[PDB]
Design a protein around this ligand. Structure first.
Ligand SMILES: Nc1ncnc2c1ncn2[C@@H]1O[C@H](COP(=O)(O)OP(=O)(O)NP(=O)(O)O)[C@@H](O)[C@H]1O
Ligand SMILES: [Mg+2]
Length: 215
C-alpha cells in the first residue's frame, strides 16, 4: 500500500513534427481509415526485426516465440489497441523515433497535403505513425524491448509527449499502441469496419492478425 514514486520525462516534439501533428488534427481529411494500415505496417516491420535478430541469436525469443498482431476494440473506454510481439522499443528508441528527431520527409509531406494529396500518402514520407491522430485525441504506446524495461509513451499532441517506466501489465516483448478515439471516430470500434479495413489495406501482412471482440 505505501505510496509509489514514478519518474516522468516530458519532451517537446521536433518543430515540423509538431506542425504536422497540428495539420493532421485540425484539417478535415476523408480516407482516415488508412491509420490502421500504418500501425499494422509498423507492427509488421517490428516483427521482421525480431524474426531476423532471432536467426542470429535464438535467445531473443526467450521473451516469447509467437510473432503476431492483435486488434482489441473496447466500446466501453472508446479505445482501439494494436498489439504486436515484434522487437519493441528501448527508452532511447521511443524518444528518438517517436518525436524528438527531425524526419527527412515531414516538410515534403506538409507541402504535398497543402497541395491536396490524399492523407493516404503519409506512409511514403516516413511519418506514418502520426496518422493515429486522424482518429485518436490521445495515443499511448506501451513497449518492451529485450534490452530494456517496459516504458510508456503518451501524447495528446499540443507539442509535448511524456515517457515513463511502465508499472502496468508486463508485456513480454513488443508494442501496444492504444488509440483513445475521438467522439466522432467510434466506427473504428466496430468489428465489421475493422475487418473491412484490414481486408482493403493490410491483406499482405506476413504475420497472423487476430481481432478480439468483447461479448
Ligand atoms: N509497433 C512498433 N514497434 C516497434 N517500433 C515502432 C512501432 N511503431 C513505430 N515504431 C518506431 O517508430 C518509427 C517511426 O514510425 P513511422 O512514423 O511509421 O515511420 P516508419 O515506419 O519508419 N516509415 C519506426 O521507424 C519505428 O522505429
Ligand atoms: Mg511506418
Amino acid at each position: 500500500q505505501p505510496m509509489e514514486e514514478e519518474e516522468v520525462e516530458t519532451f517537446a516534439f521536433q518543430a515540423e513534427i509538431a506542425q504536422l501533428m497540428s495539420l493532421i488534427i485540425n484539417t478535415f481529411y476523408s480516407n482516415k481509415e488508412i491509420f490502421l494500415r500504418e500501425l499494422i505496417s509498423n507492427s509488421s516491420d517490428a516483427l521482421d526485426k525480431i524474426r531476423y535478430e532471432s536467426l542470429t541469436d535464438p535467445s531473443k525469443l526467450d521473451s516469447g516465440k509467437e510473432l503476431h498482431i492483435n486488434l482489441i476494440p473496447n466500446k466501453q473506454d472508446r479505445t482501439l489497441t494494436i498489439v504486436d510481439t515484434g522487437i519493441g522499443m528501448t527508452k532511447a528508441d521511443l524518444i528518438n523515433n517517436l518525436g524528438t528527431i527531425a524526419k527527412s520527409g515531414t516538410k515534403a509531406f506538409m507541402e504535398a497535403l497543402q497541395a491536396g494529396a490524399d492523407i493516404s500518402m503519409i506512409g511514403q514520407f516516413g511519418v506514418g505513425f502520426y496518422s493515429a491522430y486522424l482518429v485518436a485525441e490521445k495515443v499511448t504506446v506501451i513497449t518492451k524491448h529485450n534490452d530494456d524495461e517496459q516504458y510508456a509513451w503518451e501524447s495528446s499532441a499540443g507539442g509535448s509527449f511524456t515517457v515513463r517506466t511502465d508499472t502496468g501489465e508486463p508485456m513480454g516483448r513488443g508494442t501496444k499502441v492504444i488509440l483513445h478515439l475521438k467522439e466522432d471516430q467510434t466506427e473504428y470500434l466496430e468489428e465489421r469496419r475493422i475487418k473491412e479495413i484490414v481486408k482493403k489495406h493490410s491483406q499482405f501482412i506476413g504475420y497472423p492478425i487476430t481481432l478480439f471482440v468483447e461479448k
